[PDB]
Design an enzyme around this catalytic site. Structure first.
Site, mmCIF file in Angstrom:
data_model
loop_
_atom_site.group_PDB
_atom_site.id
_atom_site.type_symbol
_atom_site.label_atom_id
_atom_site.label_comp_id
_atom_site.label_asym_id
_atom_site.label_seq_id
_atom_site.Cartn_x
_atom_site.Cartn_y
_atom_site.Cartn_z
ATOM 1 N N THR A 266 0.830 -1.195 0.000
ATOM 2 C CA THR A 266 0.000 0.000 0.000
ATOM 3 C C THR A 266 0.871 1.253 0.000
ATOM 4 O O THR A 266 1.789 1.371 0.799
ATOM 5 C CB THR A 266 -0.969 0.006 1.208
ATOM 6 O OG1 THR A 266 -1.934 -1.051 1.063
ATOM 7 C CG2 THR A 266 -1.704 1.323 1.296
HETATM 8 C C1 N2E Z 1 1.615 10.643 8.142
HETATM 9 C C2 N2E Z 1 2.344 9.399 7.735
HETATM 10 N N1 N2E Z 1 3.475 9.300 7.201
HETATM 11 C C3 N2E Z 1 3.863 7.953 6.943
HETATM 12 C C4 N2E Z 1 5.164 7.535 6.314
HETATM 13 C C5 N2E Z 1 2.773 7.337 7.422
HETATM 14 C C6 N2E Z 1 2.510 5.880 7.462
HETATM 15 O O1 N2E Z 1 3.201 5.146 6.777
HETATM 16 N N2 N2E Z 1 1.510 5.459 8.280
HETATM 17 C C7 N2E Z 1 1.016 4.140 8.552
HETATM 18 C C8 N2E Z 1 0.235 3.952 9.698
HETATM 19 C C9 N2E Z 1 -0.294 2.704 10.024
HETATM 20 C C10 N2E Z 1 -0.044 1.610 9.201
HETATM 21 F F1 N2E Z 1 -0.540 0.419 9.511
HETATM 22 C C11 N2E Z 1 0.728 1.776 8.056
HETATM 23 C C12 N2E Z 1 1.009 0.603 7.152
HETATM 24 N N3 N2E Z 1 0.840 0.531 5.736
HETATM 25 C C13 N2E Z 1 1.182 -0.609 5.357
HETATM 26 N N4 N2E Z 1 1.180 -1.112 4.014
HETATM 27 C C14 N2E Z 1 1.584 -2.292 3.782
HETATM 28 C C15 N2E Z 1 2.032 -3.111 4.933
HETATM 29 C C16 N2E Z 1 2.493 -4.529 4.648
HETATM 30 N N5 N2E Z 1 1.871 -5.070 3.581
HETATM 31 C C17 N2E Z 1 2.114 -6.312 3.132
HETATM 32 C C18 N2E Z 1 3.059 -7.106 3.775
HETATM 33 C C19 N2E Z 1 3.732 -6.583 4.877
HETATM 34 C C20 N2E Z 1 3.469 -5.288 5.336
HETATM 35 C C21 N2E Z 1 4.282 -4.835 6.559
HETATM 36 C C22 N2E Z 1 1.980 -2.576 6.168
HETATM 37 N N6 N2E Z 1 1.575 -1.348 6.343
HETATM 38 N N7 N2E Z 1 1.455 -0.558 7.448
HETATM 39 C C23 N2E Z 1 1.247 3.029 7.733
HETATM 40 O O2 N2E Z 1 1.827 8.173 7.911
HETATM 41 B B1 BO2 Z 2 -1.797 -2.340 1.671
HETATM 42 O O1 BO2 Z 2 -0.675 -3.160 1.011
HETATM 43 O O2 BO2 Z 2 -1.438 -2.289 3.153
HETATM 44 C C1 BO2 Z 2 -3.143 -3.228 1.669
HETATM 45 C C2 BO2 Z 2 -4.088 -2.584 2.676
HETATM 46 C C3 BO2 Z 2 -5.482 -2.307 2.134
HETATM 47 C C4 BO2 Z 2 -6.124 -3.512 1.466
HETATM 48 C C5 BO2 Z 2 -6.366 -1.850 3.276
HETATM 49 N N1 BO2 Z 2 -3.049 -4.648 2.027
HETATM 50 C C6 BO2 Z 2 -2.063 -5.290 2.644
HETATM 51 O O3 BO2 Z 2 -0.926 -5.281 2.205
HETATM 52 C C7 BO2 Z 2 -2.390 -6.029 3.906
HETATM 53 C C8 BO2 Z 2 -1.077 -6.236 4.639
HETATM 54 C C9 BO2 Z 2 -1.212 -6.515 6.114
HETATM 55 C C10 BO2 Z 2 -0.990 -5.489 7.022
HETATM 56 C C11 BO2 Z 2 -1.101 -5.738 8.383
HETATM 57 C C12 BO2 Z 2 -1.424 -7.014 8.829
HETATM 58 C C13 BO2 Z 2 -1.637 -8.042 7.917
HETATM 59 C C14 BO2 Z 2 -1.528 -7.792 6.556
HETATM 60 N N2 BO2 Z 2 -2.978 -7.311 3.601
HETATM 61 C C15 BO2 Z 2 -4.121 -7.713 4.141
HETATM 62 O O4 BO2 Z 2 -4.601 -7.175 5.122
HETATM 63 C C16 BO2 Z 2 -4.828 -8.881 3.527
HETATM 64 C C17 BO2 Z 2 -4.354 -10.169 3.739
HETATM 65 N N3 BO2 Z 2 -4.994 -11.202 3.184
HETATM 66 C C18 BO2 Z 2 -6.081 -11.007 2.428
HETATM 67 C C19 BO2 Z 2 -6.559 -9.719 2.208
HETATM 68 N N4 BO2 Z 2 -5.921 -8.682 2.760
#
Ligand code: N2E
Ligand code: BO2
Ligand code: N2E
Ligand code: BO2
Lengths: 214, 240, 204, 130, 206, 201, 206, 201
Positions: free
Chosen positions: F1
């Site tokens: 994301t």
């Molecule tokens: C004002 C501001 N400045 C920044 C730079 C941000 C920010 O980054 N805030 C934020 C807050 C809560 C979240 F939860 C997240 C967030 N987004 C994600 N996208 C993808 C995955 C993920 N996906 C797939 C596999 C593994 C992972 C770890 C995990 N997260 N966690 C990001 O806010």
């Molecule tokens: B983005 O990449 O964070 C996106 C968020 C959006 C769909 C709301 N999806 C994901 O990558 C998340 C990653 C994740 C973050 C924290 C805990 C677990 C996973 N994936 C999912 O939530 C997910 C997993 N399986 C099926 C559907 N969605």
């Protein structure tokens, strides 16, 4: 003692223009043994147009199938006999998976049905209810075998060739047999016999199919 | 606990405990509020010049919000409990919504409390009627009125207390729409001394403007009463 | 540990017709000085003076509940609280919260106004009552004070010469403890008067 | 009681939840009578000795008793005394006010110099009656 | 702790300064966020901590001071009464369900006589606080990583008789030391001051 | 994301990817990461897929119930404060959601941001997600307040793309919205692979 | 990781830049420490990491290139031969007693024909490395916290035909982004360049 | 332990405390924090008391054996490199020592600093120890290169004092040295409590 246990199996569905084909193999297994070969408790009927097809843990599967069964009945009683659509059931599914978020079900769900327009749409869920309408879906232990296979032959991507015409009920059914005969070869927790459900507007027809017994 | 049903229906579809709570307001002190173009004025009766009351001047019109103020009529003990529910609601609103509360929102809460006491076990209704006036965040002057039955309604010129109907039928044939500031204070005086005696130390008037609320003191109130007292002599001279 | 988070040592000695009580002046967060002019003593009447040590958040919260209960005792009962009744009162307060316990260690000193008997009491954080006739001490430098007080005490001391022993016992123990020091504030008290003295110390 | 917000205050309390601030007030037997007697003479710049002499004199009026008896009258005054329990040494950054308010109740040795001024003030308004 | 708060009181003013940095584990979200909340017309608090509990603690304190002015006819309470109300909310939260507030704050104010009978404090007020519930009236207080750099700086240079300009160039030395030694990039410091005429936002020292 | 959004002279532009990965497996590629709350608000999605889609559906219910009772639209300063009070109440329950709300109330634009821990900040420029650190360096180089409508749509579509290209948890179909005074319009919807042969032909 | 290294190669030069910050867990020791070690007259390496293994790895590499020029009569080895000698020391250290080197480095150089029979590389060389022993020849490489800010910046703006001044104003954009988003205070960046006439220390971009 | 040394126009001034504490108990109050290596070098000690007094006695042995073999004095750039190669060799053996070497070799002065992990840095201004963070802010405010000999002795004695006053692990007797071209001289040796009634009478 651990209150969670994976019972194998897989479910796959491919939705067409006025139909969905829904399949799931009949094989229950536990720790290292094989409990049964004839469990019909993997695909459940909610309404005559919408099914749920779940797998994972067999004990929490039967509990989720009953709470889905009576929320449809309170819908039918409070709305003057009106049967709920697929979109109404699949949002009911997406909420109840989040109401039990901290002691959740070890199920992985698919709500499979027809639209109000007549087209078939399958949904998929994680353990906490992340929904999306999509044209197919494959859950279970053999999901990583079949979900890339359905990407390569339904979407028709990375192939410099013109598009084939629309798939019939028969060409979808013969396609989906090639996945379960492919998951019975390479996945040890999958395959004794797969039961195909064909959901059309004029009722549902039901077929069976034989896989490898080992 | 004690929750026997008190507010019940008559054999003619009336609520006795609501009709008897309105009679407690009709013996209360009269309070008149009118609505102008840029200001809201509300004037109360302020029981008497007792000469034994404290030299610290005691306000009758209570502050509820930064821009929304309230005047009542009825039992003064019931109204204090009603306002500390409404003063608790404003701090519930600007802790969950980060916004200044509208005038129509606060009146729907106070009317919601009035109706909630008419449908509870062991509870009589509140024997109060309120006049609520205030501005929004975008100007827009408002004036509201709740009864002991719990019915909210916004008015263009409202009077509660003793002789309820006497002022309202008088100032619906003498009201000019869209007044200035000096016309509203002059019109709230001439409606309130129709009921109260001719004394000059039993009117407490307040002018609401945007982020500026000014209570009238002793000598400023003397300027507006005499301009009314000389005109009501002309109104009697116009009849004869 | 949570008990030695804020620093500070409070002790008390018993004399003939008098007693002393003395705390340090340091407040801290495990190594760094927050304040240098903060006592730990509290006076409720002309006979009872008590001192709190331990966690400073609990040193102020518990002392508010004591002042809530001591002033309510004076409204109900038309009299000042006595030493045996005050020490048995906040013994019960540390036992009600036995599983969520306060991190204070109150050092109570009291005297009878008419009789002249001193009463010392130092409970634990869980409210263990203990009344020695010689001295009490709590705080971070408490292990250093049991050597200083026991080698220098005698039962028959004048109020002027009991102050000289308690002051040299606090300072010599705070020169070995790195969480207590920065001078000391003492309070000698007899049947006739209360005298409060501030003592020179090392600013280290 | 005294506070630092408006100084000395005096309140009533009705058995309905209603209260009101006052400068002089009466509750009990003949409260309608004792209001008019306090209304006849109360002024703003009044000392405590002129207020306590006002307090005892109206009390003898309602229970129709010349020579006010000390066995049947209870008094209590609420004024500010100089603060004595100030301890700046254990509170280095806490400021103590100069004078503190003390509620007290006068004894018979304290009320006898004040009860013998209320009958004489009744006697001073007695020789000029006819 | 990544963001510092610096406050010192003098004869007729209290300086405060709080770096307006807001970050996400290494990423600078802001550089100008006001972290010195104006509670009353003569009272303010400079809270440090992450932005979750910091707003929700200050809005609970600010809306209750305003409520206590509604119910008490606009009578402004003292600075010690506000500070003792604050540490009641810190101390009751470390023994509750939801957990402790992770806020470190410096309360500041000026005491004015509300009437002629008020003979209380006339001077300025400055209170050190903590996330546990510690309360201490102190000549100067500091939080954050750069606190120890500047608390020993104020051991050297602070005087009780500093003027408005001499304490203004002292706070400039306080802000330039945090830029010199702390690895955390604090570039804008939001200097405010509490005097007998209310609060004022100093534009010069940043 | 890699959701981002920025505020400029002309409104607010929201730009997302569409990829949901449960680790090293990609679950889906057509995820709507903008839940439109109503016809003048938007909400974005990052972190847990179910935690965002639940509580922004709760947020879309509290905004609809506002209009029923009070007869007028909800502001954005009230809309995020609903979402921030919900989020701070469940801060010890292990939620994972980072959401921006963007809308046109009666006080112009406002672009907020809510954590999973109860934070709420007010800026004109954000980029959230795991690959957001790639989307800052191309956006902070080319951002200015008085951009045109077409150039700020180009800067948003190009700043998503350089983070989808570099982060493994980002990609798919770049969706660009524009929040003007009459509401929001879906500007474009295009594949990331098609967008590579436009920016590097 | 708190300090960034930025390097990109072009048609006739290789830019490098490494922030000269040295810290003790939050306390800035230095601001100008050279972290780009000049190995040969046409070769340099920009190591990042703590100052313990960083000197002791670079002194072992530099003294062995000089020893291999003593024993081989002053014949300068190629840039790939130096880079493959470096990752041999990273890869043999992750399976040893003393442990892995915690250094992340970017090798840079220019290949000149040492004789008339040399028909090897003529152009510039730039190698990404890691603490494990990964080696990758790359158009541009970045380490540190601010690496992801500036690697996607160089996805936008880097061109293979940049000149000496156009890549000089690109590196200025590379240094101003790390000052804008990274919480770690990197203020001085030590820009050097490798051309056909050797190394040169660029004074302008800092 | 608070320990600083700085470099200026006229040499190097080393200033230390004299306190050794085992947690909350103070073990000693007359610890020589400066081990003079020979008549033109110095070395300070911070961290573990035995880890410093051992390896700076090993360092004083390798400097004496240098003069026996090579017939000349050792430089400071060679003296720290002896101590840094020893320190880097035992970086996984849990040592805790942070030491500055200071001296006048034939290339003027140089002031170094060696970790317990093998680092060696070259600056003109250090302050090491647990109470070092208090000694920076009073020193960085008043430091300049062209101080006099008496004022830089005053700045060092005053910067140790404000760290001993605030840190629980620092204190005792402030010792100030001066490294000029002929060697080192012990400038002053005075109690911290006596030094409080000079700086704040
Ligand atoms: C004002 C501001 N400045 C920044 C730079 C941000 C920010 O980054 N805030 C934020 C807050 C809560 C979240 F939860 C997240 C967030 N987004 C994600 N996208 C993808 C995955 C993920 N996906 C797939 C596999 C593994 C992972 C770890 C995990 N997260 N966690 C990001 O806010
Ligand atoms: B983005 O990449 O964070 C996106 C968020 C959006 C769909 C709301 N999806 C994901 O990558 C998340 C990653 C994740 C973050 C924290 C805990 C677990 C996973 N994936 C999912 O939530 C997910 C997993 N399986 C099926 C559907 N969605
Ligand atoms: C260039 C530079 N800049 C700084 C800021 C430093 C620095 O600080 N380097 C350093 C290196 C090794 C150490 F070992 C130490 C060190 N000093 C100490 N003093 C006292 C106690 C202690 N004492 C009593 C009880 C408990 C404790 C923890 C512990 N330590 N640890 C300090 O170097
Ligand atoms: B100073 O506090 O760092 C001091 C310097 C030393 C040269 C005397 N060190 C100590 O006081 C250390 C503290 C310590 C640091 C790290 C680990 C363990 C302890 N104390 C001692 O080494 C010590 C122990 N026993 C007796 C004397 N000193």
């Amino acid at each position: 003692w651990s209150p969670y246990q994976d019972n194998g199996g897989t479910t796959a569905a491919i939705a067409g223009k006025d139909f969905v084909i829904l399949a799931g193999d009949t094989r229950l297994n536990g720790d290292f043994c094989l409990h049964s070969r004839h469990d019909q408790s993997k695909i459940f009927q909610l309404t005559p147009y919408t099914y749920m097809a779940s797998n994972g843990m067999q004990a929490d599967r039967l509990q989720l199938q009953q709470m889905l069964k009576y929320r449809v009945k309170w819908y039918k009683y409070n709305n003057g006999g009106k049967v709920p659509s697929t979109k109404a059931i699949a949002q009911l599914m997406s909420t109840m998976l989040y109401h039990r978020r901290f002691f959740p079900y070890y199920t992985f769900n698919m709500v499979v049905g027809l639209d109000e327009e007549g087209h078939g749409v399958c949904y998929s869920y994680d353990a906490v209810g992340s929904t999306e309408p999509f044209l197919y879906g494959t859950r279970g232990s053999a999901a990583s075998f079949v979900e890339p296979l359905l990407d390569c032959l339904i979407n028709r991507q990375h192939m410099t060739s013109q598009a084939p015409p629309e798939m019939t009920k028969e060409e979808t059914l013969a396609m989906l047999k090639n996945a379960f005969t492919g998951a019975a070869e390479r996945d040890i927790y999958t395959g004794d016999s797969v039961s195909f459900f064909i959901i059309t507007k004029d009722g549902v027809q039901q077929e069976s199919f034989e896989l490898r017994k080992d | 606990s004690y929750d026997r049903a008190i507010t019940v229906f008559s054999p003619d579809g009336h609520l006795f405990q609501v009709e008897y709570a309105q009679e407690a307001v009709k013996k209360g002190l009269a309070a008149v509020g009118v609505l102008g173009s840029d200001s809201v004025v509300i004037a109360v009766e302020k029981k008497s010049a007792v000469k034994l009351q404290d030299s610290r001047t005691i306000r009758k019109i209570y502050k509820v919000d930064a821009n929304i103020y309230l005047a009542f009529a009825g039992l003064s003990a019931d109204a204090r409990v009603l306002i500390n529910k409404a003063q608790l609601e404003c701090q519930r609103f600007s802790l969950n919504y980060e916004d200044t509360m509208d005038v129509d929102m606060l009146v729907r809460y106070v009317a919601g409390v009035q109706q909630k006491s008419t449908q509870s076990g062991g509870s009589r209704p509140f024997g109060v009627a309120t006049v609520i006036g205030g501005f929004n965040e975008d100007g827009k002057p408002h004036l509201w009125k709740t009864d002991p039955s719990g019915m909210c309604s916004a008015w263009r010129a409202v009077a509660i207390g003793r002789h309820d109907q006497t002022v309202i039928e008088y100032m619906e044939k003498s009201y000019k729409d869209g007044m200035s500031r000096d016309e509203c204070v002059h019109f709230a005086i001439k409606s309130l001394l129709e009921v109260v005696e001719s004394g000059s130390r039993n009117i407490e008037l307040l002018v609401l403007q945007y982020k500026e609320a000014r209570y009238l003191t002793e000598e400023e109130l003397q300027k507006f009463v005499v301009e009314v007292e000389k005109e009501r002599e002309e109104e009697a001279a116009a009849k004869k | 540990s949570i008990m030695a988070y804020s620093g500070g040592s409070v002790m008390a000695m018993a004399g003939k017709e008098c007693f002393v009580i003395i705390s340090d002046n340091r407040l801290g967060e495990q190594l760094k000085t927050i304040s240098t002019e903060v006592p730990k003593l509290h006076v409720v009447n002309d006979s009872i003076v008590y001192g709190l040590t331990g966690l400073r958040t609990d040193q102020q919260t518990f002392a508010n509940k004591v002042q809530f209960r001591t002033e309510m005792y004076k409204l109900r009962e038309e009299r000042d609280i006595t030493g045996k009744a005050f020490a048995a009162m906040i013994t019960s307060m540390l036992y009600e919260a036995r599983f969520g316990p306060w991190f204070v260690e109150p050092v109570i000193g009291s005297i009878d106004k008419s009789t002249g008997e001193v009463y010392l009491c130092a409970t634990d954080l869980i409210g263990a009552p203990c009344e020695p006739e010689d001295y009490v001490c709590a705080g971070t430098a408490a292990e250093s004070l049991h050597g200083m007080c026991e080698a220098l005490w005698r039962p028959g001391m004048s109020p002027e010469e009991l102050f000289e022993i308690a002051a040299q016992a606090m300072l010599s123990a705070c020169d070995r403890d790195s969480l207590s020091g920065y001078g000391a504030v003492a309070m000698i008290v007899t049947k006739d008067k209360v005298t409060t003295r501030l003592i020179k110390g090392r600013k280290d | 009681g005294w506070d630092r917000y408006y100084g000395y205050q005096l309140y009533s309390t009705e058995p309905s939840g209603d209260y009101s601030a006052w400068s002089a007030y009466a509750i009990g037997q003949n409260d309608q009578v004792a209001h008019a007697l306090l209304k006849k003479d109360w002024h703003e710049s009044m000392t405590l000795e002129d207020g306590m002499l006002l307090a005892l004199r109206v009390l003898g009026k309602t229970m129709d008793t010349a020579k006010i008896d000390l066995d049947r009258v209870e008094v209590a005054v609420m004024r500010k005394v100089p603060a004595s329990n100030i301890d700046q040494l254990l509170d280095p950054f806490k400021h103590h006010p100069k004078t503190t308010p003390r509620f007290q109740i006068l004894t018979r040795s304290e009320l006898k110099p004040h009860a013998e001024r209320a009958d004489q003030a009744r006697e001073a308004e007695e020789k000029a009656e006819a | 702790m990544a963001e510092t708060a610096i406050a010192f009181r003098c004869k007729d003013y209290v300086m405060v300064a709080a770096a307006g940095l807001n970050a996400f584990y290494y990423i600078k979200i802001t550089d100008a966020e006001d972290k010195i909340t104006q509670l009353d017309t003569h009272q303010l608090v400079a809270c440090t901590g992450e932005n979750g509990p910091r707003v929700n603690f200050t809005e609970y304190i600010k809306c209750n001071l305003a409520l206590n002015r509604m119910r008490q006819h606009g009578r402004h309470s003292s600075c010690e009464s506000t500070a003792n109300f604050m540490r009641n909310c810190l101390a009751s939260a470390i023994r509750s369900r939801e957990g402790a507030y992770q806020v470190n704050c410096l309360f500041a104010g000026y005491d004015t006589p509300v009437s002629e009978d008020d003979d209380g404090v006339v001077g300025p007020q400055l209170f050190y606080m903590d996330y546990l519930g510690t309360l201490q009236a102190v000549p100067y207080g500091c939080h954050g990583y750069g606190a120890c750099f500047v608390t020993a700086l104020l051991d050297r240079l602070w005087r009780p008789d500093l003027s408005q300009q001499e304490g203004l160039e002292l706070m400039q030395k306080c802000c330039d030391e945090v830029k010199r030694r702390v690895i955390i990039s604090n570039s804008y410091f939001f200097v405010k001051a509490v005097t007998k005429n209310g609060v004022e936002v100093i534009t010069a020292v940043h | 994301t890699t959701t981002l959004a920025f505020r400029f002279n002309g409104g607010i532009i929201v730009a997302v990817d569409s990829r949901a990965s449960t680790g090293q497996y990609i679950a889906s590629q057509t995820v709507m990461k903008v839940l439109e709350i109503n016809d003048y608000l938007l909400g974005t999605l990052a972190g847990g897929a179910a935690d965002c889609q639940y509580w922004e559906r709760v947020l879309g219910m509290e905004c609809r119930l506002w209009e029923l009772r009070n007869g007028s639209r909800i502001t954005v300063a009230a809309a995020s404060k609903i979402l921030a009070n919900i989020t701070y109440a469940y801060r010890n329950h292990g939620l994972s959601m980072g959401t921006m709300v963007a809308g046109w109330d009666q006080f112009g634009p406002s672009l907020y941001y809510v954590d999973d821990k109860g934070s709420r900040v007010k800026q004109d420029l954000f980029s959230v997600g795991s690959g957001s650190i790639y989307a800052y360096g191309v956006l902070d180089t080319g951002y200015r307040k008085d951009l045109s409508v077409e150039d700020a749509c180009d800067l948003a579509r190009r700043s998503i793309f350089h983070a989808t290209y570099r982060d493994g948890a980002s990609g798919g179909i770049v969706t660009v919205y524009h929040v003007h005074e009459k509401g929001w319009t879906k500007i474009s919807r295009d594949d990331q692979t098609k967008l590579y042969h436009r920016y590097f032909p």
